[PDB]
Amino acid sequence: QSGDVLSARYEIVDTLGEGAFGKVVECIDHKAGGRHVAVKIVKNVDRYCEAARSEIQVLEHLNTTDPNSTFRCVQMLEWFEHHGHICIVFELLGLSTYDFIKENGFLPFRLDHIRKMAYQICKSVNFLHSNKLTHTDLKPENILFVQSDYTEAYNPKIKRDERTLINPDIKVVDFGSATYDDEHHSTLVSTRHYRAPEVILALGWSQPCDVWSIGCILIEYYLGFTVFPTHDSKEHLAMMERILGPLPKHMIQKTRKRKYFHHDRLDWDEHSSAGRYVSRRCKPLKEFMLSQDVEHERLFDLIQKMLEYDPAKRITLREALKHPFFDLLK
Ligand SMILES: Nc1nccc(-c2c[nH]c3ccccc23)n1
């Protein structure tokens, strides 16, 4: 649909992303000097229409409270309808953190950069949690760089050229699934690899599910790959038990997902083929650390706290923002 013109000013010039909802495109703005903006064009389908209308209402609230994007939510500039598609116009951001890592060969981010990004992500989502909202769909595809310009240098260690961001500042996008405390809470939220155990076990969720997703994001930034290479719920749980230890009994007792459990234990055979796969690919969390220096132990301390099983016990973002891991930023 490149060449189409929306609202008589925004001409499509490229596709930035795609999703359940539709697509995000880059447009030239013919009424503002040809400067470029992003536009989310939503499918003409009820569920996605209603999510976009929700998104707009959230964005108007967040933009009114924080018009300068101090807390780094993406800025909506305007919204309109076009051939029954709701279109939301945004400031143009650069690549998602996912796309940057992909294009860099799945090399992980440097720790100094991870520190800055984690801080900004926590600061943004916390702003949300302070406003009775939960995002519910945090993942690297929904954390975008403000500018994804990079310098390149030969890295002798790994015998290859690598890209380093000039500026690693980010913003959080996609408020289509965002849910106020008092609204209906969907049964299933999040993209599988970022999904908290309370969601898998259908216990109910709130702000702490976002904290779990952030835990998973930070691991991926650190390693360049997921520690939950799965598309199956019961196996995901097996993976969690290998990385983090057994699930709390009280959560197993509460759940109605009885098919995952035998007696009051995860119904998992470590000697099955799936069992080998899990044992090969997943190991205790701190065994993933690439170094033992204190900066690393502290990242991993934080991550472990974010990946607390019990959402009542899990670290809050308010508490995360004061974590020792973040001092070299002050
Ligand atoms: N709200 C929302 N939901 C999903 C994706 C985007 C989005 C993807 N790529 C972008 C580039 C610039 C501004 C926004 C986006 N935004």
Coordinates of N, CA, C and O in Angstrom, one line a residue, residues 128-129 131-134 179-185 206-207:
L128 N 3.6 4.2 34.1 CA 2.3 3.5 33.9 C 1.7 2.9 35.1 O 0.5 3.1 35.4
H129 N 2.5 2.2 35.9 CA 2.0 1.6 37.1 C 1.5 2.6 38.2 O 0.4 2.3 38.8
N131 N -0.1 5.2 37.4 CA -1.3 5.7 36.8 C -2.4 4.6 36.7 O -3.3 4.7 35.9
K132 N -2.3 3.5 37.5 CA -3.2 2.4 37.5 C -3.3 1.7 36.2 O -4.4 1.2 35.9
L133 N -2.2 1.6 35.5 CA -2.2 0.9 34.2 C -1.1 -0.3 34.3 O -0.1 -0.1 35.0
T134 N -1.4 -1.3 33.5 CA -0.4 -2.4 33.3 C -0.3 -2.5 31.7 O -1.4 -2.6 31.0
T179 N -4.1 -2.0 30.4 CA -5.3 -2.3 31.1 C -5.3 -1.5 32.4 O -4.4 -1.6 33.2
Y180 N -6.3 -0.7 32.7 CA -6.5 -0.1 34.0 C -6.9 -1.1 35.0 O -7.6 -2.1 34.7
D181 N -6.6 -0.7 36.3 CA -6.8 -1.5 37.4 C -8.3 -1.9 37.5 O -8.6 -3.1 37.7
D182 N -9.2 -1.0 37.3 CA -10.6 -1.2 37.4 C -11.3 -1.9 36.1 O -12.5 -2.2 36.2
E183 N -10.6 -2.1 35.0 CA -11.2 -2.6 33.8 C -11.1 -4.1 33.8 O -10.3 -4.8 34.5
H184 N -11.7 -4.7 32.8 CA -11.7 -6.1 32.5 C -10.3 -6.5 32.2 O -9.6 -5.8 31.4
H185 N -9.8 -7.6 32.8 CA -8.5 -8.1 32.6 C -8.6 -9.4 31.7 O -9.2 -10.4 32.1
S206 N -1.8 -8.4 37.6 CA -1.8 -7.0 37.7 C -0.4 -6.4 37.4 O 0.3 -7.1 36.6
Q207 N 0.0 -5.3 37.9 CA 1.3 -4.7 37.5 C 2.5 -5.7 37.6 O 3.4 -5.5 36.8

